[PDB]
Amino acid sequence: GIFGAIAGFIENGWEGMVDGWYGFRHQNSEGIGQAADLKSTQAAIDQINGKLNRLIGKTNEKFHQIEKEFSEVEGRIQDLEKYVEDTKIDLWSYNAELLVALENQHTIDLTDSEMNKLFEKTKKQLRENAEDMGNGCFKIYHKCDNACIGSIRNGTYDHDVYRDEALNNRFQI
Amino acid sequence: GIFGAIAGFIENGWEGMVDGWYGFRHQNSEGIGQAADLKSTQAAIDQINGKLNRLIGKTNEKFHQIEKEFSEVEGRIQDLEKYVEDTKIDLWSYNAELLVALENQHTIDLTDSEMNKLFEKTKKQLRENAEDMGNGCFKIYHKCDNACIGSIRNGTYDHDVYRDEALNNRFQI
Amino acid sequence: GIFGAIAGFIENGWEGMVDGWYGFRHQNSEGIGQAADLKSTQAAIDQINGKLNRLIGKTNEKFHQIEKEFSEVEGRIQDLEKYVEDTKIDLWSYNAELLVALENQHTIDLTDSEMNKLFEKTKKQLRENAEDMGNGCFKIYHKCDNACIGSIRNGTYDHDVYRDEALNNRFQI
Amino acid sequence: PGATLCLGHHAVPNGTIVKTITNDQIEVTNATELVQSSSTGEICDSPHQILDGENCTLIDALLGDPQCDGFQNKKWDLFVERSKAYSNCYPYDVPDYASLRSLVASSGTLEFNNESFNWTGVTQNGTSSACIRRSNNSFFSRLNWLTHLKFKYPALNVTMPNNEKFDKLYIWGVHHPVTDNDQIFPYAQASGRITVSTKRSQQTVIPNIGSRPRVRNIPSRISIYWTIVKPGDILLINSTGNLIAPRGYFKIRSGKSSIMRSDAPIGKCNSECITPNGSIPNDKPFQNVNRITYGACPRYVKQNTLKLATGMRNVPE
Amino acid sequence: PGATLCLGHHAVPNGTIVKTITNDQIEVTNATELVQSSSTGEICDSPHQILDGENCTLIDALLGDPQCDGFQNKKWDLFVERSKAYSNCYPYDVPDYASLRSLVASSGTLEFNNESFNWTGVTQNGTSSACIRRSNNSFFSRLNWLTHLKFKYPALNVTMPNNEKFDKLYIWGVHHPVTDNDQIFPYAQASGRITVSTKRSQQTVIPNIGSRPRVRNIPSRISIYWTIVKPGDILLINSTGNLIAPRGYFKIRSGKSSIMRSDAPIGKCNSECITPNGSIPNDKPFQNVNRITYGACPRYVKQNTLKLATGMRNVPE
Amino acid sequence: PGATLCLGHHAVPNGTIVKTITNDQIEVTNATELVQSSSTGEICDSPHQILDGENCTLIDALLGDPQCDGFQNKKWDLFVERSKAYSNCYPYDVPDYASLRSLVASSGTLEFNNESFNWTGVTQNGTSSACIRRSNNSFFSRLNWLTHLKFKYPALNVTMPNNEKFDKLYIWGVHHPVTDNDQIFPYAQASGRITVSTKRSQQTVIPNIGSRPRVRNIPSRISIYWTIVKPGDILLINSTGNLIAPRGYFKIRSGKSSIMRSDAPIGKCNSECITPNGSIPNDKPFQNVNRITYGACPRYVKQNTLKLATGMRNVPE
Ligand SMILES: *[C@@H]1O[C@H](CO)[C@@H](O[C@@H]2O[C@H](CO)[C@@H](O[C@@H]3O[C@H](CO[C@H]4O[C@H](CO)[C@@H](O)[C@H](O)[C@@H]4O)[C@@H](O)[C@H](O[C@H]4O[C@H](CO)[C@@H](O)[C@H](O)[C@@H]4O)[C@@H]3O)[C@H](O)[C@H]2NC(C)=O)[C@H](O)[C@H]1NC(C)=O
Ligand SMILES: *[C@@H]1O[C@H](CO)[C@@H](O[C@@H]2O[C@H](CO)[C@@H](O[C@@H]3O[C@H](CO[C@H]4O[C@H](CO)[C@@H](O)[C@H](O)[C@@H]4O)[C@@H](O)[C@H](O[C@H]4O[C@H](CO)[C@@H](O)[C@H](O)[C@@H]4O)[C@@H]3O)[C@H](O)[C@H]2NC(C)=O)[C@H](O)[C@H]1NC(C)=O
Ligand SMILES: *[C@@H]1O[C@H](CO)[C@@H](O[C@@H]2O[C@H](CO)[C@@H](O[C@@H]3O[C@H](CO[C@H]4O[C@H](CO)[C@@H](O)[C@H](O)[C@@H]4O)[C@@H](O)[C@H](O[C@H]4O[C@H](CO)[C@@H](O)[C@H](O)[C@@H]4O)[C@@H]3O)[C@H](O)[C@H]2NC(C)=O)[C@H](O)[C@H]1NC(C)=O
Ligand SMILES: *[C@@H]1O[C@H](CO[C@H]2O[C@@H](C)[C@@H](O)[C@@H](O)[C@@H]2O)[C@@H](O[C@@H]2O[C@H](CO)[C@@H](O)[C@H](O)[C@H]2NC(C)=O)[C@H](O)[C@H]1NC(C)=O
Ligand SMILES: *[C@@H]1O[C@H](CO[C@H]2O[C@@H](C)[C@@H](O)[C@@H](O)[C@@H]2O)[C@@H](O[C@@H]2O[C@H](CO)[C@@H](O)[C@H](O)[C@H]2NC(C)=O)[C@H](O)[C@H]1NC(C)=O
Ligand SMILES: *[C@@H]1O[C@H](CO)[C@@H](O[C@@H]2O[C@H](CO)[C@@H](O)[C@H](O)[C@H]2NC(C)=O)[C@H](O)[C@H]1NC(C)=O
Ligand SMILES: *[C@@H]1O[C@H](CO)[C@@H](O[C@@H]2O[C@H](CO)[C@@H](O)[C@H](O)[C@H]2NC(C)=O)[C@H](O)[C@H]1NC(C)=O
Ligand SMILES: *[C@@H]1O[C@H](CO)[C@@H](O[C@@H]2O[C@H](CO)[C@@H](O)[C@H](O)[C@H]2NC(C)=O)[C@H](O)[C@H]1NC(C)=O
Ligand SMILES: *[C@@H]1O[C@H](CO)[C@@H](O[C@@H]2O[C@H](CO)[C@@H](O)[C@H](O)[C@H]2NC(C)=O)[C@H](O)[C@H]1NC(C)=O
Ligand SMILES: *[C@@H]1O[C@H](CO)[C@@H](O[C@@H]2O[C@H](CO)[C@@H](O)[C@H](O)[C@H]2NC(C)=O)[C@H](O)[C@H]1NC(C)=O
Ligand SMILES: *[C@@H]1O[C@H](CO)[C@@H](O[C@@H]2O[C@H](CO)[C@@H](O)[C@H](O)[C@H]2NC(C)=O)[C@H](O)[C@H]1NC(C)=O
Ligand SMILES: CC(=O)N[C@H]1[C@H]([C@H](O)[C@H](O)CO)O[C@@](O)(C(=O)O)C[C@@H]1O
Ligand SMILES: CC(=O)N[C@H]1[C@H]([C@H](O)[C@H](O)CO)O[C@@](O)(C(=O)O)C[C@@H]1O
Ligand SMILES: CC(=O)N[C@H]1[C@H]([C@H](O)[C@H](O)CO)O[C@@](O)(C(=O)O)C[C@@H]1O
Ligand SMILES: *[C@@H]1O[C@H](CO)[C@@H](O)[C@H](O)[C@H]1NC(C)=O
Ligand SMILES: *[C@@H]1O[C@H](CO)[C@@H](O)[C@H](O)[C@H]1NC(C)=O
Ligand SMILES: *[C@@H]1O[C@H](CO)[C@@H](O)[C@H](O)[C@H]1NC(C)=O
Ligand SMILES: *[C@@H]1O[C@H](CO)[C@@H](O)[C@H](O)[C@H]1NC(C)=O
Ligand SMILES: *[C@@H]1O[C@H](CO)[C@@H](O)[C@H](O)[C@H]1NC(C)=O
Ligand SMILES: *[C@@H]1O[C@H](CO)[C@@H](O)[C@H](O)[C@H]1NC(C)=O
């Protein structure tokens, strides 16, 4: 939510995108298509794996400790033993609750961020050749075949090649 | 602070806005006015209520515990009882201090985010019909009466209706 | 990483910038130069100092406590004394690990944010006189001597002075 | 001509200061307090079952000090001990007083069932002038002071099985006589001993001839001890003198009950959370009223105040 | 004509609900469980050295109750006590049973070295009918019941130095005879005493004439005590009757060993983390199986489940 | 022609690695260490009042072992016990040594007021050859060894009220004679007993005839006990032999005082935070020097190092 892309200006996700987390859909003269973006997908996945690496398989060894169950009524010393354990458990329970809540807010925000960055990077690439339709889509003001679209997805798009064509289409009447 | 809108490119808040947290001010041929934005206001309020719901009315029941005040000098066992309680209190005091500090940083940032999103959404809506003056205000390069302004606030503004008028005004000499 | 500027659209940092954290490099008719931005630099530094002020020199006094080393085997009461201390140390060790990890993520993100804000503010200042090259650099479509560049760095740049010259250069063929 | 459209946000004339990660003072439009720092000063009588000890400690209600007679068989979620309380029966001490107090408080009942012990070879129901009940020499209602029969005394060996489903709690003790004026008057010999045992437990206690400092003008003492007898098990008492014997047992229960020291008055009101200062509301997650609490309470912390922002940064006009 | 290029993100038909700071229910594309909530039900015999107590408590294996004879000198990372266990030797109690159990469990060995004590003026190796070993009256294998020699008994004064590099643990006790049928039969006099001392320690214990409730049809009791003798130090025993004497010492070690109460069967499998419910995997950082653990375990928490998001917000099509 | 304006940020040739939520190694331009991991090796004599025990334990300074005579009436914020310390007076043990040590350490003073006890019917000021003071047989300066008067000994009954505003701490003990060579020489009878009582407390102790292992060539022992007497209250001593009597009382105070075991030398320097390894600076919020601390100290944690970023991500050129 914090960047405003996922569940924001992007109306919804694409169930038909199964080979990546983020990507591109296009309509041009040659049809309508989809391709996943690997770098943004992997950027997100690496960060989540980072969090997992700190949390999975990291346990602490303990051996002889205090007794935690009792069959006799004893009073003072047993009170202290139970209290110490109950205290400990509440503090770790709190740690675990907060941890998950923060991690989850951060994961949601970083994934929104990755969507936003890809969008922004694509916008700059297009220079004066496209306009932002406000819903994650760019109107490209020039003939842009499959190789051209591919060139935008691959970071090899030369905006100067189409600038004349696009300015003419953009600033028409 | 993290998005740069509130206490950033927006110079200050509006004390005269009492029916929302975020909104619009305009100057057009028909006068100067203000209207609150409900959706962004409510987006912010819901998130803060979310935080409140985890914190207000959520208490934990405890019953028989250890003694925490003493009228006799006793030594070892009393030392341990006091130490356990003093330990516990410091850890909860730390939890409470950190919690509030993080929550407050997050609240400040999410509210800044909501301002930023509204601004961004309004910018995209205007397409080529306005320019960003750098202080949260757009210069709209066309006659935009109260209904037109209302159309921008309501998400029904058709940029194509005014594009010819606005490009002419924008790219003048 | 969360704003996409530092280690993102800005390819790398500048080792030759020693008088600030953020700044400007330019090429114009009069040569190629560098100047640090103080306000964004100081914005970052103040926030980091804020974090330091909560952490440095803030210690807690303790006096008589429990014994934590033992020369005799004693059983139950000694078990509880060790367990209480071992419990405490793990909880503080956890607090310290999480604290640093969160602080460090936040510091990285706020510094990225400051870079992003400066960039954004500079973009708006340029209005229709420049385009974003996608790598932190603006192509300025007008003669912009050292005083002009200085005027952009100081927030005194009047985009109207150059707009005619720049639109002509931008929308050429 | 055109138009201008400005995006903005509200501000208030009266902001509140909060703390953040980067900033110990930043002004927001609004906040709410997370630390409860006040009590009404009354312990609310609901929804917890309160038992005001008044002049009586739990231990004195347990032993049956005559002024505590009204407490017989009562239950409580919270027993409240008053600082004005005092003992007014035979002087006594309880080794591990704190543990007996604790386990009774936690059991949360004074339910007592009388038992008929085979006491022949001794005079039961011994009394004294420092334990006045109903304007007549008396003793602790739950204890039976065992003395001679016709200036003689044989070896006692009384047994009592627990065929119930709960633990039985037996309170008993030892007399420590003042001189040889009270060594040959109530027991009729030179020496004594008490051995209170089970299948799983044994406590033996030796009496002591000697004057103590006077407490309500009596220089002798009683020493109080206890024994828990589980289901299927048996209590055995070998006595050759000095036994302050149980008249039966107390039910031990498990539950949420406790005890608290407080001089706060009991009010007719409803509050989940009790401290020694009085009840407190529990809307807030934290409190700095007292580290001692009972019920659904905010957690105790050292801070007076902790403000959570419930609004954006305030940037006035 | 032109073209359209839309940026987007995936979504799944089956999202998972997670909690955040602002939202107790938000759907993400994927999550993973951080709380381990299941056990296979077996305590895995690897990689920790497990010693199944079976019918024997650690204390009964220590004293040498005949049915525990198989435990002599064994080591363990984890001693497992079974709820079906029972004692089948002479009835006894251990003041501070919990501490002896604890320090032995933690020492993690029953290594015992016999020692030749100068026992003249008494008959060693006393036996009884309630401690049957190999179809013949017997006693605790590590204890030596000392009785008369020709209906007489002088003042014992036996000494034994610790010239080793480790602490020695000595287990010993006191007999408490049933009547005067067992006061003049095994000791041959009116009175008795035991004083077990070192350079740095002294414990004295007075015997007690008296019948207890019968436990496996014996009404006498033994009371078990212990003494740690450090390097360079000496154990001294002054006895004038009633000594249940050590036949030597146990090695005290320091290490990672413990004891756990569980009825879970021991399986042939490998798991780092042991609870009383059985072993559990330790991939997760938290667990709600049991607060009692041994080994590399997730930390115990009250929550059943805690889902960590491993995907973006799910916004289906 | 035009111009180009690039926005950027600094970088350094020598970055530091820090940890984040997503990344266990990320390079930043700068960091600072949050864990204090070094000491100078000296306990600074300021700003806390240090009392170096040298050859004396607190207990030996308390009892008044002659070599500890210099400690009489001293105060301390921190009493430092040295591992080289040793006792050089009459051999003794203190049941619950740890609690006496603790409550004295916490009281933080050895202020002693002498009191004139009515000791008639006994010879005061008993001495021995294992407690040499000023080249002459002597005893603990704060204890009065009470023996016969003309080979006879009656029943003592001495009383002493506390009319002060503070608790009085009384240290006293029991002699346990070697044989009957020291049963008829210093006390002149067969048997003995000590009963030290108040309005609210009673301790009785039985002496023991028996040789212990020799400690500095003496085989007898003394057993040290204590009694706190509150304001308005009274101490009573019933003795029929063997009393090691107080010569007065110690002031009990409440405050910030403690005790620490350390062999670190005391330096002339100023440091708020003391560990057994020496003083440490307290600029950092955490420390891994020692879990034992006194004063304004960083909190102990297991980590060696924890680097807080004080700069942006380093992305070199
Ligand atoms: C600054 O920020 C705070 C927090 O966001 C705002 O305070 C909250 O305001 C709302 C609405 O005014 C309050 O809602 C009311 O709660 C009452 C419950 O009473 C106690 O319990 C709560 C926790 O549950 C405590 O925190 C609180 O101190 C109370 O003692 C209800 O009884 C109220 O119900 C009444 O109104 C509603 C109308 O919605 C009806 O449905 C009911 O029938 C009834 O008439 C009400 O729901 C909320 O309790 C406040 N929270 C806190 C923490 O104080 C401030 O408003 C805000 N300031 C500004 C200027 O905006
Ligand atoms: C939803 O989100 C989770 C977490 O991101 C994903 O689950 C992870 O998926 C990966 C890859 O499928 C798993 O990796 C495998 O780990 C095995 C280890 O077994 C246990 O240990 C881990 C912790 O180390 C436990 O968390 C886990 O529960 C296991 O019980 C390895 O044995 C596997 O190795 C095999 O495959 C690799 C191929 O990469 C080969 O190198 C090996 O030779 C071998 O054949 C493998 O590495 C990972 O354990 C999962 N994590 C968790 C926490 O469950 C889900 O995939 C994801 N769902 C969707 C739909 O995307
Ligand atoms: C990498 O990051 C760190 C942290 O941001 C920087 O280190 C800080 O640098 C400042 C300025 O150089 C230091 O300020 C000095 O503090 C001294 C106090 O001494 C101790 O106490 C502090 C805590 O209060 C400890 O952290 C520290 O280790 C010290 O042992 C003062 O005595 C100094 O005063 C002198 O200079 C000032 C000028 O401003 C004068 O006013 C005085 O009269 C006097 O002459 C000074 O204030 C700060 O202590 C450092 N912090 C830490 C945690 O180390 C690094 O500079 C930075 N590296 C780079 C390359 O940028
Ligand atoms: C609880 O006790 C109070 C306090 O007074 C007691 O003080 C003791 C030291 C002892 O002297 C005892 O006799 C005395 O009762 C009671 O208040 C007093 O009650 C007596 C009853 O005869 C009256 O004569 C007094 O006027 C009255 N004095 C005061 C100052 O209150 C109180 O009645 C009693 N309450 C309960 C519920 O038992
Ligand atoms: C603290 O004691 C030391 C250590 O020496 C003591 O060792 C004991 C076992 C015992 O033998 C005792 O007599 C002996 O003093 C003292 O150092 C020694 O002091 C004696 C005094 O006569 C000297 O003869 C020795 O040379 C010296 N030896 C060593 C190795 O230091 C020390 O003087 C004393 N310090 C204080 C402050 O009391
Ligand atoms: C003390 O009382 C008990 C109970 O009456 C006596 O124990 C019984 O003794 C007989 C033998 O005389 C046994 O057969 C019974 O099984 C015992 N009964 C129970 C319930 O334990 C005990 O002997 C008495 N003590 C003395 C010294 O006579
Ligand atoms: C509630 O009562 C507690 C305990 O009596 C109060 O805290 C004590 O206050 C007194 C007087 O200020 C001090 O002398 C004590 O040292 C304090 N004790 C503790 C443990 O803090 C507390 O002030 C009261 N709180 C309220 C809200 O009434
Ligand atoms: C109990 O035994 C010890 C050890 O034999 C006796 O202590 C020895 O006594 C002689 C004098 O008779 C001393 O010279 C030795 O140094 C002592 N040896 C040790 C190793 O301590 C002790 O006296 C005996 N008790 C009795 C009452 O005779
Ligand atoms: C593991 O065993 C523990 C302890 O026996 C179980 O928790 C107990 O469950 C019983 C029956 O539901 C309750 O009566 C007890 O009050 C529980 N005790 C405690 C301390 O929680 C637990 O349910 C078992 N867990 C698993 C996964 O088998
Ligand atoms: C032990 O000493 C105390 C104090 O002298 C004696 O107690 C006093 O006894 C008289 C009666 O003889 C009482 O009237 C006083 O009130 C008591 N005074 C105090 C201060 O308690 C006690 O009797 C003595 N013990 C013996 C056995 O004579
Ligand atoms: C400070 O002293 C402590 C305690 O003596 C040191 O920690 C011990 O180090 C020794 C030798 O490495 C180990 O055998 C012990 O097991 C350690 N004990 C504990 C409790 O950790 C510590 O290394 C010293 N620290 C410094 C900075 O000098
Ligand atoms: C059962 C019995 O004998 N009770 C008598 C007691 C005891 O002898 C002493 O309290 C024991 O020391 O003494 C009295 O003077 C008393 O205190 O009132 C008379 C009372 O009848
Ligand atoms: C060493 C010895 O004397 N053992 C005898 C014991 C003891 O006298 C009593 O157990 C002590 O009370 O009594 C027996 O009847 C028995 O229990 O089997 C016979 C046995 O030979
Ligand atoms: C007060 C007294 O009688 N002191 C004497 C003691 C004691 O009799 C024993 O230490 C008690 O066992 O014995 C000495 O040999 C000694 O130790 O120096 C002589 C000393 O005069
Ligand atoms: C873009 O990259 C894809 C995937 O590697 C490649 O197959 C394709 O030919 C590239 N297209 C263009 C237009 O460069
Ligand atoms: C916009 O919405 C407001 C508030 O609901 C409505 O009253 C107004 O008529 C709308 N204006 C336009 C121009 O659509
Ligand atoms: C901009 O600010 C700098 C630094 O203060 C100043 O020296 C310079 O003259 C200014 N330049 C312009 C063009 O205003
Ligand atoms: C500001 O003043 C108003 C009007 O009296 C009051 O209702 C409100 O609670 C105040 N808010 C804060 C945050 O102080
Ligand atoms: C959704 O369904 C697929 C296909 O069965 C399954 O593999 C996957 O684990 C499910 N994911 C979630 C998050 O429930
Ligand atoms: C990098 O090197 C400089 C120059 O010696 C030094 O002052 C600085 O502390 C170093 N910084 C880091 C972060 O290592």
Ligand 4 contact, D52 CB (< 6 A): no
Ligand 19 atom closest to Cα of residue E29 = 13
Polymer length of chain A: 173
Query: Which amino acid, residue A33?
Result: G
Identify any residues that bridge with E173 across adjacent strands, giving them in sequence order: E224, E244
Cα separation of the two ends of chain E: 28
**C21 and chain F in contact, CB less than 8 A:** yes
Q: Which residue has the tokens 């090899």?
A: A156
- F93 contacts E201? CB cut-off 8 A: yes
Question: What's the CA-to-centroid distance between F282 and ligand 3, angstroms?
Answer: 15
**F85 and chain C in contact, CB less than 8 A:** no
Residue of C nearest to B88 (CA): C88
Helix and strand tally (H, E) in chain E?
2, 29
Q: Exposure pattern of E106-120 as b/e (b: 16+ CB <10 Å)? A: bbbbbbbeeeebebe
DSSP code, position A21: S
> Which among B8, B2, B10 has a CA at the least distance from the CA of B136?
B10
**B154 and chain E in contact, CB less than 8 A:** no
**Distance of alpha carbon C148 from alpha carbon C141, whole angstroms:** 13
**A130 and chain E in contact, CB less than 8 A:** yes
Polymer length of chain C: 173
**Distance of alpha carbon B100 from alpha carbon B98, whole angstroms:** 6
SS3 content of chain A, % helix, strand, coil (to 5): 55, 15, 30
DSSP code, position A75: -
**D4 and chain B in contact, CB less than 8 A:** yes
Q: Is D54 left (phi over 0), alpha (psi -120 to 50) or beta?
A: left
**Residues whose CB is less than 8 angstroms from the CB of residue E96 and which lie 6 or more positions away in sequence, other chains included:** C75, C76
CB D279 within 8 A of CB D42: yes
**Distance of alpha carbon D253 from alpha carbon D236, whole angstroms:** 23
Helix, coil or strand: residue A45? helix
Hey, of A42, A45, A47, A52, which one would you mutate to test binding to chain F, going by the most F CBs within 10 A of its CB? Answer: A47
Give the tokens for residue B133.
């003056």
- Residue E277 CA, chain-centre distance (Å), reads 18
**Distance of alpha carbon B16 from alpha carbon B39, whole angstroms:** 19
Task: Provide DSSP, E123-190.
Answer: B----EEEEESSSSEE--TTEEE-B-SSS----EEEEEE--SSS-EEEEEEEEE-SSSTTTSSSS-SS
Query: Which amino acid, residue E112?
Result: F
Pairing of strands C60-62, F221-229: unpaired
Helix, coil or strand: residue E258? strand
Give the tokens for residue A134.
């406000």
Question: What's the CA-to-centroid distance between F58 and ligand 16, angstroms?
Answer: 85
Q: Which residue has the tokens 């993690």?
A: E108
Residue of E nearest to D196 (CA): E212
> Which among D219, D213, D143, D205 has a CA at the least distance from the CA of D174?
D205
Identify any residues that bridge with F251 across adjacent strands, giving them in sequence order: F168
Ligand 17 contact, C151 CB (< 6 A): yes
CB F204 within 8 A of CB F195: yes
Question: What's the CA-to-centroid distance between E314 and ligand 19, angstroms?
Answer: 13
**Distance of alpha carbon E251 from alpha carbon E244, whole angstroms:** 20
What range defines the domain where residue F140 resides? 49-264
Question: What's the CA-to-centroid distance between E14 and ligand 19, angstroms?
Answer: 6
Q: Is A168 left (phi over 0), alpha (psi -120 to 50) or beta?
A: alpha
- B76 contacts F99? CB cut-off 8 A: yes
Query: Which amino acid, residue A140?
Result: I
**Residue D121 buriedness (CB in 10 A; 0-12 / 13-18 / 19+):** middle
- F22 contacts A47? CB cut-off 8 A: yes
**Distance of alpha carbon B34 from alpha carbon D10, whole angstroms:** 11
Distances in Å between the Cα of E267 and the Cα atoms of C91, E42, E45, E290, F22 are: 34, 6, 6, 19, 39
How far off is chain F from D215, nearest CA to CA, in Å? 6
Hey, of B42, B45, B49, B54, which one would you mutate to test binding to chain E, going by the most E CBs within 10 A of its CB? Answer: B54
Q: Which ligand is nearest to the CA of F67?
A: 5
Hey, of A100, A124, A137, A170, which one would you mutate to test binding to chain E, going by the most E CBs within 10 A of its CB? Answer: A100
**Distance of alpha carbon B61 from alpha carbon B38, whole angstroms:** 40
CB E125 within 8 A of CB E175: no
**Distance of alpha carbon D261 from alpha carbon D258, whole angstroms:** 11
Question: What's the CA-to-centroid distance between E264 and ligand 9, angstroms?
Answer: 13
> Which among F106, F94, F118, F138 has a CA at the least distance from the CA of F245?
F118
**Distance of alpha carbon D184 from alpha carbon D176, whole angstroms:** 13
Pairing of strands F294-297, F273-275: antiparallel
Q: Which of residues 261-300 of F touch C (CB under 8 A)?
A: 261, 272-273, 282-286, 291-300
Task: Provide DSSP, F192-224.
Answer: --EEEE-SS-EEEE-----PPPPBTTB--EEEE
Give the tokens for residue D146.
């065992």
> Which among D314, D316, D290, D284 has a CA at the least distance from the CA of D302?
D290
CATH, residue D132: 3.90.209.20
Distances in Å between the Cα of D63 and the Cα atoms of B148, C135, D13, D69, D131 are: 87, 86, 65, 10, 12
Taking the CA atoms of D222, D225, D231 and D237 in sequence, report the sign of the dihedral they define. negative
- Residue A10 CA, chain-centre distance (Å), reads 13
Ordered by where they begin, the domains of chain A are 1-173 (3.90.20.10)
Q: What is the 3 state secondary structure string of F35-61?
A: EECCCCCCEEEECCCEEECCCCCHHHH
**Residues whose CB is less than 8 angstroms from the CB of residue F241 and which lie 6 or more positions away in sequence, other chains included:** F153, F187, F189, F191, F192, F193, F194, F207
How far off is chain A from D255, nearest CA to CA, in Å? 13
Residue of E nearest to B52 (CA): E22
**Distance of alpha carbon B167 from alpha carbon B153, whole angstroms:** 22
CB A170 within 8 A of CB A131: yes
Q: Exposure pattern of A135-161 as b/e (b: 16+ CB <10 Å)? A: ebbbbbbbebeeebbbbbbeeebebee
**Residue D261 buriedness (CB in 10 A; 0-12 / 13-18 / 19+):** middle
Q: What is the 3 state secondary structure string of F94-150?
A: CCCHHHHHHHHHHHCECCEEECCCCCCCCECCCCEEEEECCCCEECCCCEEECECCC
- Residue F271 CA, chain-centre distance (Å), reads 21
**Residue F42 buriedness (CB in 10 A; 0-12 / 13-18 / 19+):** middle
Q: Which ligand is nearest to the CA of F146?
A: 14
**Distance of alpha carbon E178 from alpha carbon E207, whole angstroms:** 11
**A73 and chain B in contact, CB less than 8 A:** no
Residue of E nearest to A145 (CA): E3
Ligand 4 atom closest to Cα of residue D55 = 1
**Distance of alpha carbon F215 from alpha carbon F90, whole angstroms:** 9
Distances in Å between the Cα of A144 and the Cα atoms of A24, A160, D47, F95 are: 14, 13, 74, 93
Spell out the long-range contacts of E68-71 with Cβ–Cβ below 8 A and sequence spacing 24 or more: E69/E133, E69/E141, E71/E110
**Distance of alpha carbon D69 from alpha carbon D54, whole angstroms:** 12
Question: Up-side HSE of residue E310: CA atoms within 13 Å toward CB?
Answer: 15
Contacts of E176 in chain D (CB under 8 A): 202
**Distance of alpha carbon E210 from alpha carbon D155, whole angstroms:** 10
**Distance of alpha carbon D108 from alpha carbon D257, whole angstroms:** 5
Query: Which amino acid, residue E299?
Result: R
Resolution given for this structure, in angstroms: 2.4
Ligand 4 contact, D69 CB (< 6 A): no
User: Cα torsion at F277, F278, F284, F285 (round to 10°)?
Assistant: 60
**Distance of alpha carbon E76 from alpha carbon E51, whole angstroms:** 6
**Residues whose CB is less than 8 angstroms from the CB of residue F219 and which lie 6 or more positions away in sequence, other chains included:** F178, F211, F212, F213
> Which among F158, F173, F196 has a CA at the least distance from the CA of D208?
F196
How far off is chain E from A128, nearest CA to CA, in Å? 14
Q: What is the 3 state secondary structure string of chain B?
A: CCCCHHHHHCCCCECCCCCCCEEEEEEECCEEEEEEEHHHHHHHHHHHHHHHHHHCCCCEEECCCCCCCCCCCCCHHHHHHHHHHHHHHHHHHHHHHHHHHHHHHHHHHHHHHHHHHHHHHHHHHHCCCEEECCCCEEEECCCCCHHHHHHHHCCCCCHHHHHHHHHHHHCCC
**A72 and chain D in contact, CB less than 8 A:** yes
**E198 and chain F in contact, CB less than 8 A:** yes
Task: Provide DSSP, E91-127.
Answer: -EE-TTHHHHHHHHHHHTB--EEE------SSB----
**Distance of alpha carbon E13 from alpha carbon D314, whole angstroms:** 42
Of E210, E213, E223, the CB nearest to D199: E213
Taking the CA atoms of E35, E40, E42 and E45 in sequence, report the sign of the dihedral they define. negative
> Which among D73, D81, D26, D27 has a CA at the least distance from the CA of D53?
D81
Q: Which residue has the tokens 């190789």?
A: A147
Query: Which amino acid, residue C79?
Result: D
Identify residues after which chain C is interrupted (C–N over 2.5 A). Answer: none
CB C129 within 8 A of CB B170: no
Q: Which ligand is nearest to the CA of A85?
A: 9
Contacts of F99 in chain B (CB under 8 A): 74-77
DSSP code, position A8: I
- Residue F133 CA, chain-centre distance (Å), reads 23
**Distance of alpha carbon E143 from alpha carbon E174, whole angstroms:** 11
Identify any residues that bridge with E158 across adjacent strands, giving them in sequence order: E237
Supply the Cα-derived Rg of chain B in whole angstroms: 27
Pairing of strands F221-229, F92-93: parallel
Distances in Å between the Cα of C157 and the Cα atoms of C33, C120, C143, C169 are: 18, 15, 13, 19
